[PDB]
Amino acid sequence: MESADLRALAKHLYDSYIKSFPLTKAKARAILTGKKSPFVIYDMNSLMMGEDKIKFKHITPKEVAIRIFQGCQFRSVEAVQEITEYAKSIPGFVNLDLNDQVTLLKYGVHEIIYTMLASLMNKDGVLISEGQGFMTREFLKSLRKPFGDFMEPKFEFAVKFNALELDDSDLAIFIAVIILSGDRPGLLNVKPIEDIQDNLLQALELQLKLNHPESSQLFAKLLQKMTDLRQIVTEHVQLLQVIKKTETDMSLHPLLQEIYK
Amino acid sequence: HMESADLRALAKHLYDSYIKSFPLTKAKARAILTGKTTDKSPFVIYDMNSLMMGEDKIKSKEVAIRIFQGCQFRSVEAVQEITEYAKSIPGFVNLDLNDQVTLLKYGVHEIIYTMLASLMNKDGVLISEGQGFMTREFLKSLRKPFGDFMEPKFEFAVKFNALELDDSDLAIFIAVIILSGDRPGLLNVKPIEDIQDNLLQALELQLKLNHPESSQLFAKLLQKMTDLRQIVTEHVQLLQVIKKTETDMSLHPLLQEIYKD
Numbered sequence: 001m002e003s004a005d006l007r008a009l010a011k012h013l014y015d016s017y018i019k020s021f022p023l024t025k026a027k028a029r030a031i032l033t034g035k036k037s038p039f040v041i042y043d044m045n046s047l048m049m050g051e052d053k054i055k056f057k058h059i060t061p062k063e064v065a066i067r068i069f070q071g072c073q074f075r076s077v078e079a080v081q082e083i084t085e086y087a088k089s090i091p092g093f094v095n096l097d098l099n100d101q102v103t104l105l106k107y108g109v110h111e112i113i114y115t116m117l118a119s120l121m122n123k124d125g126v127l128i129s130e131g132q133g134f135m136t137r138e139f140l141k142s143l144r145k146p147f148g149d150f151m152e153p154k155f156e157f158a159v160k161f162n163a164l165e166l167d168d169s170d171l172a173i174f175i176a177v178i179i180l181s182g183d184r185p186g187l188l189n190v191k192p193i194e195d196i197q198d199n200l201l202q203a204l205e206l207q208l209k210l211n212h213p214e215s216s217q218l219f220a221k222l223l224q225k226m227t228d229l230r231q232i233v234t235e236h237v238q239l240l241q242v243i244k245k246t247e248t249d250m251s252l253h254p255l256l257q258e259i260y261k
Numbered sequence: 262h263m264e265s266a267d268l269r270a271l272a273k274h275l276y277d278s279y280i281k282s283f284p285l286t287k288a289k290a291r292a293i294l295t296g297k298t299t300d301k302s303p304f305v306i307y308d309m310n311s312l313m314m315g316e317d318k319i320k321s322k323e324v325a326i327r328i329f330q331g332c333q334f335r336s337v338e339a340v341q342e343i344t345e346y347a348k349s350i351p352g353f354v355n356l357d358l359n360d361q362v363t364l365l366k367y368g369v370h371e372i373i374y375t376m377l378a379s380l381m382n383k384d385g386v387l388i389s390e391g392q393g394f395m396t397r398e399f400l401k402s403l404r405k406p407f408g409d410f411m412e413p414k415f416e417f418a419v420k421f422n423a424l425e426l427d428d429s430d431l432a433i434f435i436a437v438i439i440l441s442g443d444r445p446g447l448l449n450v451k452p453i454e455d456i457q458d459n460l461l462q463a464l465e466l467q468l469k470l471n472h473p474e475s476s477q478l479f480a481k482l483l484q485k486m487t488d489l490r491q492i493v494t495e496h497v498q499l500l501q502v503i504k505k506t507e508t509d510m511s512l513h514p515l516l517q518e519i520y521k522d
């Protein structure tokens with residue numbers, strides 16, 4: 001493609017990413033740096049006041065560590081719908097075979113959730129409830145049994161990912177590249193998927209050169225992070241399996257379990 | 262950032278050392294696999310008896326063990342060749358000694374799988390410096406856990422080989438793998454990443470010049486570094502099962518130290 005068309009595609013994706021995701025990285029950073037303060041959850045008593053005052057919707061029908069864990073599952077289900085609507089704006093995506101559309105979303109949403117979660121994280125905690133709350137890393141890491149070790153890998157990835165200093169216009173193309181992965185299992189027609197991904201990679205490459213001209217081989221370094229994502233997603237799955245087979249206090253209402261499947 | 266002419270100089274340096282360090286290149290393997298040559302034809306091992314005849318021609322334990330022990334023997338040789346190659350990568354021997362060890366520990370296996378693909382097609386793999394060829398089917402029919410040992414290698418190779426890299430491409434790709442700054446336990450990540458930036462620039466220009474019609478081959482090749490990380494993980498878990506089941510079987514010290522942690 002011609003440079004001018006790559007810029008058009010980049011601009012198209014940025015506008016749609018703004019409409020699909022309510023809390024952007026730009027806004028989240030304004031909150032985290034200190035540049036209406038968020039309510040801070042740093043221990044058991046401040047958690048209690050937070051749901052009493054802000055009323056986090058990932059709450060009400062239990063042990064605290066379980067309630068927090070399920071809260072992360074609730075938000076993840078919300079995010080899937082936001083990612084799904086974004087994918088529809090990627091040129092060519094809705095023209096793919098319907099089963100392949102479903103397959104790309106199924107295997108891609110986990111990598112995108114971790115990616116975008118880094119936008120809401122710093123080394124000390126994570127924004128919640130569209131940025132109205134902030135949950136400290138320490139409070140999370142101090143949850144009992146396997147739950148303490150659940151959130152820490154996310155922070156460790158986020159600290160390293162954020163060192164790249166990407167902005168929302170970079171991330172919108174990066175997220176698109178992840179969705180159009182031609183190596184997802186069960187794809188019926190790989191060729192148009194890889195054809196779209198080639199366009200997106202060209203647009204990401206030019207975007208990074210123009211937006212970060214002093215950041216040598218940022219393109220390559222960002223592609224290398226797709227290894228960190230694939231690796232952390234697999235660990236996540238293994239962590240769930242261990243919770244499912246050991247924690248008898250996890251059962252929800254059957255309808256809820258279905259929503260959260 | 263480097264000038265184009267210096268990047269070409271580095272590509273030629275690395276290709277030259279790759280030829281000096283690895284006796285069986287992809288170019289040689291392909292000439293043997295393609296055929297049409299009476300002087301380079303391999304003896305083919307496809308079952309028990311042809312294996313028995315093979316030892317008389319190419320030149321008391323169970324078959325699956327003898328084959329398995331054969332692969333670890335060749336792996337130790339490959340580690341040796343890979344170590345000699347790394348010493349030629351500009352800047353590598355100037356790094357902190359512990360980091361030199363660390364880069365090799367985590368990198369040798371990803372490189373072994375990469376170069377093993379050169380010796381592979383969908384039906385089998387060259388052995389004994391290309392004098393032999395062992396079919397995929399024969400490997401997959403080996404008993405116990407050994408049958409499933411090589412098939413993941415074959416599955417990766419078929420996709421990696423579709424990229425159609427030649428030895429001059431692979432020489433830079435292998436160098437990029439070795440100089441990974443995200444290896445666990447590295448003491449000085451920054452000097453490793455400066456070297457890799459140079460290597461990534463050299464790979465980018467090499468791929469553009471040697472494959473001008475292969476759009477985004479650079480990006481596609483980097484995404485393959487993801488398939489490598491996952492295949493190493495499977496391998497390590499397969500070994501562990503064998504260590505705890507075949508208590509009379511032993512690894513080479515070099516291999517033992519690599520897999521520790």
Ligand SMILES: O=C(O)c1ccc(-c2nn(C(=O)c3c(Cl)cccc3C(F)(F)F)c3c(Cl)cccc23)c(OCc2ccccc2)c1
Pocket residue numbers: 058068069071072073074075076079110113114116117120126127128135150151154
């Ligand atoms: O607003 C967002 O964009 C947002 C996106 C992701 C999470 C979040 N997901 N998450 C997972 O575990 C996870 C992941 Cl990464 C990928 C796939 C699936 C899951 C699943 F289902 F297991 F939940 C997290 C962990 Cl472990 C620690 C911190 C955050 C997360 C998020 O949390 C906000 C939050 C809400 C309530 C209480 C505390 C924090 C917000």
